[PDB]
Design a protein around this nucleic acid. Structure first.
Lengths: 712, 113, 209, 106, 302, 193, 196, 107
RNA sequence: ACGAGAACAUGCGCGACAUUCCGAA
């Protein structure tokens, strides 16, 4: 198990830094700390921890076959003295070319605060004690235990700085550094095994020039796996049962993407460390640049194409594009890192262009018999349709519904509910059921939700919280005693997110570990903190990730939580990241595809120009976030609500007067304000707002909001 | 917005007082006559309309003599002179504009109360 | 065979008519036809008052809280909206418009089609009078009323027209809209012609007054 | 409160003149005595009420009593009386009757 | 052949359904127009040989008071900013005068977004209606949504029809009848009325006279199995699934769906030109349901 | 549900003034009119004064139950319909022709010195008659006798007092002459009352 | 051969027409010009309902308005387009400063508490007119006249009925003016064809 | 209006122009106007008595005589009698009211 | 042989309940 030893050593190579900060070199301290534990006393792990730096590696006196050389070179590639120093926010360096360099740091989900802070040695001692207790009994060494070790490392070291060098910035966390070092070490081990290298020292370390040569040798593969058809699969559904299936379809697609990633990693005998990013249908991975890896990629691509053709025809598809990457490219010494990622994306797009082959196109038009009956949510008739007109999928998606609320684990097993590649099935099940599935058969995968493999996904649904309204679902949101019964749909997206990845981090800071840290921070914000942001609101989170954010709930709750989310996103990114969203208000039984399309066009309207705007209900409601929060609501809506508390007919008269800009209507509005029997100063304020352009629109929006709030 | 300016310039505080104590009660008869003429015009200037406008000017003078506040309002806002202008031009659009001007005057007078 | 019978006639305002309409220091103006800015009698008010008076005459169900809980004759004439028991309304009463004859009679004598009635409320503890102005349609006015009866059942037509005659009698002895308990809304119906415009039904022996 | 009705008769011992605002010079036929719409001479109740108010000068008790306009008086009673001023006056011995209704019990 | 520009100006809102009645597309593909033409020629008792053998048409493309639009070619864009590629992706139609500039990659991401927002077709909307057919039989109203698209006063649709003199004349007669027959999914219920004008287009004649190393699909098309061997090599395309119900009074007693078809969307780029086919998508019917998959080719230099 | 129509005449014993100072006139005929609102308000006030009043009676919705029964109520959650529908009392055509026989105007003008600032008040000429039209709604058979007793008491009080204008100064006295009390609508028996 | 007959004309809003910013009970409006419209679906449905009541679905109703019943698929002969707010009425309302729509204020007096419940509905003003455009498809010559009779009947009924949103309470009364009835397609002689 | 010009010409106003002396003429005009308002030979008799009373007030007060001379009111009464229509009498009454109103306005 | 064909945003609804142009000379 030399590969497993290298994995364990590379993940834990800097475990001694925590002990050192708790208060010899950190490598020796970590070696002693790991030697305290018998299971981790294996030669490879302790050798990697002890001798991953040049000073110790020079006089290690090893057999030249040790994985310590690979650990050292992976640490050099990944990383390429205030003991009580905090973790610097990654966004401090992003967009620093324009909006400057900030001083936000994390205190020992956490928000940077931009304040002077230190990590107390007592805190590090407590962390060391926690690590000792967890390693003594709860953790073990083995092929199946490395996933648990990675999850434990992510849970503990996520906010521990990787290095405390004062000259450099502390953006990269200890967990990010360890994970990137482990992934690079695994790739280098696979490369050397493919090249039949016996003496690692003589290969890279011994002359000290072969290390630079290996840095110049192409060893890695940047792989992008893109799933297309997600939006149409989720939202293009028709029927009265579509609202209950809205979240189930998105969850099924996310779990399918995770299953694809896990299958690809298992074929390559790699762990989740090599999985750099997983978002809205995209998966970025770092693989070895071996012939075996390329053959595995080709076989996986062909098999996935065949499975998606068999199950979904042209509805859903997946593509895989890989580009050969160098150690210098990972370290960005030359500057080709952004070029590498752009090349990967362009190759992925080129593959998405010529998506199907000759034989597949010919088989598409074979269509032996007519469709006849077709299912309700799916306008597919090729699939065999059951009674009540439900297709094989969406009959099982509905079963995943009413069980996602009840159960917490997602089981990929030989028998289940929704089909998955390699002849598997996804089923939502509880703890006992998942354990039963594992006991009955192997190769069964368990996915925990925000807690096996842990998946970070926003699953906030206010309907499931109340047992009485659980069966109703999203429609339960329109059940209200005051206010117009409507559903608010929020379609939000980060502006220039890919551009921020490519150029937001300057060339002097861009690297693989920086990209991993930034992607992990964005994923943690949009999969974990979003649920805490939306607490107590009648909102159902259908899709997350920041790249494509879709929520549905009550219209006023959606607007309020959109304002709160904008403020929290400004806090989390410490500025330097704009946030544009489109809000729509639709009745129940309105087509879900229609709601999605209208909110999408509102989102596109908000995107153009300032790229920091909100389309509230139509093309005339493009406002700023501060303008909507302060001017429309706080400065105008609140005084009118206070004065009128119903005055619905009075507000309708004001609206019909404001819709006409003729000066006679101005005089009529003055007379109406005179006859309104409210405070004179507020009448003057309303008249001034009406007179001034760009304030009359805010007044009209406030009046409409109040009317919608006072409806029956 | 000449009406707004002419109603603002004479706004004083003693209780906001407009035109030395003008109230809508003093303008009720004038408003009634103007409404009658406006309805007659809208239903259809005519000879009877011109006679109505001349009687309106006579009533303007009578109310100006009766109440000092009405006199101040009339001399400030040039309502009777605009009636003469409407009589001279003798087009229904000008009378509609005069009615809109009087409506704006009374609306702004109530607005600053 | 669908038979539609038309009743066209006049409604005369015996005492000042005030039907409130959103849209001058008066407390409340009257509803007016926007196109001509002339006072109007909406068919909604006529139908509602006739239905209410018929319901009072026949007798309300004890504890009644819906208009669909009226007598079967009322639901037959004025319509019903019960789930599974929705009855089409045979009576279609239209807006009554200020007639051209009355408009000419008011252009003569130089009248304004409307009057500002001054009233006041005398407080029961301080004897101070708070004034109030209302707008009323002058008692010389007449309105063209047009009603359509739908023959959905030949047998019940005579009974329905007897009910309509009773409702018209009640409305004549009652008022139409506004503060009619204080000398408002007094009206009289003068039927010009009851004819079967559509179909072959013989409505010669049918009268609502 | 209890309402009481009094038939009040005023006997004319001296000439009484109530101004009607009308004066006729010699060409017409002299202050004219007040007559109602029908043309009959009468004593308005307002004049008597004002005279009683002046005699008293409380306020609440005086406003409780209502004194109606007097019944029409016979035309023969009117005559011309010199004071260089001539006025129409009721002849001596004429009785003018009116009704007074009091709501004040005390 | 003879090329005629046919411009359709719509009087009422038009309903173009992708898969649902609530869907409101702004254009139709070539197969829908060809099905309408076949139905019209059958109503007028005309020969279908000219339509099935010689007529070559393109999809309905937007036009406004400024210029005529064409589908965006599926070409490789060289493009530091990944969002620029998203701006290019959201683009759908390009003016004819800007087509060669776009092919040479002279349109930037900001310019592409400006072109996309310069489209002045019209406004899509959703009209909610009721069905009272159940109310009489002790039932309830059944609300349903119809998606429609109202074109701007100077905007509208157009298509280029290619054929010989007989085919062009028969097409003129068929379009004259179609003006009152209508196109769309609610023709008998008040949507889809239009007036058409057929004229020679010197602008589009010059555009089509151009040659180049690449070919662009102006119509939804699909090659036969024989032609698919060499045309698909080194091609950027998009497979669109053409589905629908058979609209006729004689196909079957009850309404049934056609066999699903897959066609290359308009704007797809191929290095080998292929001639399409009128694919028979009927499945055990009284007649044969046609689907127009012929290719209208625009040559260009990438 | 019956409607009793009570018609008659209101005779102006002493000059009657109801302001609109000029007396209110019917716009169509340009003749004096006694509005139904005036008659209803005066009768309700007099009848309420006849019955006891609560010490803090600041609203018309908290009168005696008979008052709310006859004249209606707007109390929240206790809206009672008005069994009485008083109509406008128009100038009697018989009295109009009587006035037209001679050179007599329908209205007189009376001057008070106000010692002295002269004040002129227009009144309806003594002897004029106005025909009224009251509608009583029979919504409770057992209460009809009590309601008509209250109506008779209110009519007697109004004949004792004045109607509109300044009555203490002596103007506004009226008399009621009842013509016929017949149930115009329904089968109720109004012969006794 | 096949023929199509065009019928153009005006629909006059005799009484306020209501067919379903922030407005209580808005009327259906054109999405672009924000002008009130009469949907062709409403006209078709009202005419079909009146014809079904008159005749009585019947073969004539399915023949005119179309049928999709199993084994009885009939193409709709009557294509009734949306009625658009006429330009002449638009100019007349632009003059005299009149809005194209009015807000009718109503209430409901409860049978229990007698409290009025305020309500507002948008309506098209009585002065308004709408351009209506109908296409008749001559699928069978011999029946054409009969169909038009039915059409005439329906129109007659429609001029005694309402169009939508009210009617029994005074809304929606309309009148038809037939400007022309011309055969646009074919050679059928439509000169003698008439409505009303 | 001719009334305003003659009134402002009389403005220096005269005692006849003042409402005090003009009160009797106003009351007589009011009597005849109320008769016509209710509505004639009686109107003709009232107009004749109005002319006689104009002479009466001219004799009793020179200022009223000057007012009558300047305003041609007796001549207008003669013109109305010659025309003998309700409309011309209403116009004459409106002219007299305009005279009084302008006299009050200038005072 | 037009994601098509058939489908009335339709049915019930009073702008309504109570109110002195009034006290003083």
């Amino acid at each position: 198990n030399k590969k497993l030893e290298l994995m364990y050593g590379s993940l834990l190579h800097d475990i001694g830094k925590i002990v050192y900060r708790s208060n010899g070199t950190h490598s020796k301290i970590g070696s002693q700390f790991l030697n305290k534990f018998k299971p981790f006393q294996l030669s490879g792990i302790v050798d990697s921890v002890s001798y991953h730096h040049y000073k110790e590696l020079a006089s290690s006196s090893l057999l030249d076959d040790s994985v310590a050389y690979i650990t050292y070179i992976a640490d050099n590639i990944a990383s390429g003295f205030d003991k009580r120093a905090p973790l610097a926010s990654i966004f401090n360096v992003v967009n620093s070319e324009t909006k400057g360099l900030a001083n936000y740091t994390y205190s020992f989900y956490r928000y940077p605060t931009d304040a002077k802070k230190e990590y107390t040695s007592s805190q590090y001692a407590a962390l060391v004690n926690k690590m000792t207790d967890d390693l003594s009994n709860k953790l073990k060494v083995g092929p199946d235990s490395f996933s648990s070790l990675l999850q434990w490392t992510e849970s503990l070291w996520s906010y521990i700085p990787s290095s405390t060098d004062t000259n450099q910035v502390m953006d990269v966390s200890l967990y990010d550094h360890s994970k990137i070092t482990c992934a690079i070490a695994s790739c280098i081990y696979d490369y050397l095994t493919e090249m039949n290298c016996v003496n690692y020292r003589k290969e890279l370390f011994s002359p000290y020039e072969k290390t630079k040569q290996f840095y110049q040798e192409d060893v890695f593969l940047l792989v992008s796996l893109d799933m297309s058809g997600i939006q149409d699969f989720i939202y293009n559904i028709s029927g009265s049962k579509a609202l209950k299936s809205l979240r189930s379809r998105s969850f099924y697609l996310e779990t399918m993407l995770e299953s694809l990633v896990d299958d690809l990693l298992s074929d390559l005998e790699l762990s989740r460390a090599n999985l750099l990013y997983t978002g809205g249908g995209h998966a970025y991975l770092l693989l070895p640049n071996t012939e075996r890896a390329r053959d595995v990629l080709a076989s996986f691509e062909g098999e996935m194409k065949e499975w998606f053709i068999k199950i979904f025809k042209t509805d859903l598809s997946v593509a895989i594009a890989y580009k050969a990457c160098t150690g210098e490219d990972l370290m960005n010494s030359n500057g080709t890192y952004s070029d590498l990622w752009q090349t990967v994306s362009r190759k992925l797009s080129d593959k998405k262009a010529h998506k199907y082959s000759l034989n597949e196109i010919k088989l598409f038009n074979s269509t032996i018999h007519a469709g006849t009956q077709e299912c309700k949510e799916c306008l597919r008739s090729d699939i065999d349709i059951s009674e009540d007109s439900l297709c094989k999928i969406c009959e099982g998606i509905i079963a995943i519904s009413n069980d996602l609320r009840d159960y917490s684990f997602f089981v990929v097993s030989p028998e289940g509910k929704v089909p998955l590649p390699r002849n598997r099935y996804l089923s939502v099940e509880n703890q006992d059921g998942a354990e039963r599935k594992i006991k009955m058969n192997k190769e069964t995968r368990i996915y925990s939700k925000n807690q096996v493999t842990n998946l970070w996904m926003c699953d906030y649904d206010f309907s499931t919280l109340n047992p009485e309204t659980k069966k109703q679902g999203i429609a339960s949101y329109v059940n209200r005693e005051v206010g117009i019964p409507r559903l608010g749909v929020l379609r939000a997206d980060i502006d220039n997110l890919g551009t921020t990845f490519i150029k937001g981090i300057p060339e002097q800071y861009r690297s693989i570990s920086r990209t991993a840290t930034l992607s992990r921070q964005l994923s943690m914000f949009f999969k974990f903190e979003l649920s805490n942001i939306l607490k107590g609101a009648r909102i159902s989170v259908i899709y997350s990730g920041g790249d494509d954010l879709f929520l549905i709930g009550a219209w006023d709750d959606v607007i309020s939580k959109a304002l709160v989310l904008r403020k929290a996103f400004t806090r989390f990114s410490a500025g330097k990241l704009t946030f544009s969203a489109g809000i729509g208000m639709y009745p129940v039984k309105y087509p879900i595809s229609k709601m999605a399309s209208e909110t999408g066009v509102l989102e596109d309207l908000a995107k153009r120009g300032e790229k920091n705007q909100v389309a509230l209900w139509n093309d005339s409601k493009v406002f700023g976030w501060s303008q909507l929060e302060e001017q429309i609501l706080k400065e105008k809506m609140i005084p009118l609500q206070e004065a009128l508390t119903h005055g619905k007919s009075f507000l309708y008269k004001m609206l019909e007067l404001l819709r006409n800009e003729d000066q006679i209507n101005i005089a009529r509005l003055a007379y109406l304000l005179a006859r309104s029997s409210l405070s004179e100063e507020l009448t003057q304020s309303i008249f001034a707002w009406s007179q001034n352009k760009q304030q009359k629109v805010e007044l009209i929006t406030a009046i409409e909001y109040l009317v919608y709030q006072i409806r029956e | 917005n000449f009406a707004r300016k002419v109603v603002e310039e004479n706004k004083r505080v003693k209780e906001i007082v407009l035109f030395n104590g003008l109230t809508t009660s003093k303008l009720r008869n004038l408003l009634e006559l103007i409404n009658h003429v406006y309805t007659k015009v809208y239903n259809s200037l005519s000879e009877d309309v011109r006679d109505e406008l001349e009687y309106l000017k006579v009533k303007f003078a009578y109310e100006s003599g009766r109440e000092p506040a009405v006199r101040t309002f009339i001399e400030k806002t040039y309502v009777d002179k605009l009636v003469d202008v409407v009589l001279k031009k003798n087009t229904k659009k000008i009378f509609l504009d005069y009615c809109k001007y009087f409506e704006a005057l009374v609306a702004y007078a109530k607005f600053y109360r | 065979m669908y038979s539609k019978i038309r009743i066209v006639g006049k409604i005369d305002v015996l005492t000042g008519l005030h039907i409130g309409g959103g849209g001058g220091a008066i407390a409340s103006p009257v509803v007016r036809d926007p196109y001509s800015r002339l006072p109007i009698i909406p068919g909604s008010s006529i139908k509602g008052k006739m239905r209410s008076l018929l319901a009072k005459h026949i007798g309300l169900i004890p504890g009644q809280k819906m208009h669909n809980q009226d007598a079967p004759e009322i639901l037959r004439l004025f319509g019903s909206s019960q789930k599974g028991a929705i009855q089409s309304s045979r009576l279609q009463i239209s807006d009554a418009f200020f007639s051209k004859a009355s408009q000419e009679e008011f252009d003569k004598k130089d009248l304004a089609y409307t009057e500002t009635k001054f009233e006041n409320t005398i407080s029961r503890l301080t004897a101070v009078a708070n004034p109030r102005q209302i707008e009323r349609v002058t008692r010389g006015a007449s309105f063209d009323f047009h009603i359509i009866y739908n023959v959905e059942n030949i047998n019940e037509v005579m009974a329905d027209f007897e009910n309509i005659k009773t409702a018209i009698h009640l409305l004549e002895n009652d008022y139409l809209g506004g503060g009619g308990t204080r000398g408002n809304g007094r009206i009289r119906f003068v039927i010009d012609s009851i004819d079967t415009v559509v179909g072959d039904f013989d409505s010669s022996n049918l009268s609502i007054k | 409160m209890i309402e009481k009705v009094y038939q009040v008769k005023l006997k004319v011992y001296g000439p009484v003149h109530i101004g009607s605002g009308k004066i006729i010079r010699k060409q017409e036929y002299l202050h004219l005595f007040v007559r109602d719409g029908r043309g009959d001479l009468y004593i308005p109740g307002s004049s008597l009420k004002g005279a009683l108010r002046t005699v008293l000068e409380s306020a609440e008790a005086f406003h409780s009593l209502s004194i109606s306009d007097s019944l029409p008086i016979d035309p023969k009673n009117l005559a011309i009386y010199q004071k260089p001023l001539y006025r129409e006056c009721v002849n001596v011995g004429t009785t003018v009757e009116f009704t007074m209704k009091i709501n004040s019990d005390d | 052949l003879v090329v005629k520009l046919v411009k359709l100006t719509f009087k009422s809102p038009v309903h173009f359904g992708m898969k649902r009645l609530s869907d409101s597309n702004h254009t139709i593909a070539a197969d829908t127009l060809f099905s309408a033409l076949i139905i019209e020629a059958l109503q007028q008792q005309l020969e279908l040989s000219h339509l099935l053998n010689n007529l070559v048409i393109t999809d309905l493309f937007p036009y406004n008071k400024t210029s005529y639009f064409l589908p965006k070619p599926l070409i490789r864009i060289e493009g530091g900013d990944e969002s620029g590629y998203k701006a290019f992706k959201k683009l759908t139609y390009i003016p004819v005068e800007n087509y060669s500039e776009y092919l040479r990659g002279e349109i930037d991401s900001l310019e592409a977004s400006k072109i996309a927002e310069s489209l002045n077709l019209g406004k899509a909307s959703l009209s909610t209606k009721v069905s009272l057919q159940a109310v009489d039989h002790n039932g309830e109203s059944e609300p349903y949504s119809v998606g429609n698209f109202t074109f701007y006063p100077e905007s509208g649709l157009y298509f280029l029809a290619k054929g010989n003199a007989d085919t062009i004349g028969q097409l003129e007669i068929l379009m004259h009848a179609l003006q009152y027959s209508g196109i769309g999914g609610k023709r008998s219920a008040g949507y889809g009325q239009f007036r058409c004008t057929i004229e020679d287009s010197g602008k589009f004649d010059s555009l089509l006279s151009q040659t180049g190393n690449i070919a662009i699909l102006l119509s939804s098309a699909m090659a036969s199995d024989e032609e698919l061997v060499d045309c698909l090599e080194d091609a950027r395309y998009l497979l669109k699934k053409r589905t629908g119900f058979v609209q006729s009074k004689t196909y079957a007693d009850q309404l049934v769906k056609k066999k699903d078809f897959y066609a290359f969307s308009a704007g797809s780029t191929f290095y080998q030109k292929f001639n399409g086919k009128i694919f028979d998508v009927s499945d055990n019917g009284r007649h044969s349901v046609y689907r127009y998959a012929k290719a209208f080719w625009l040559e260009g230099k990438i």
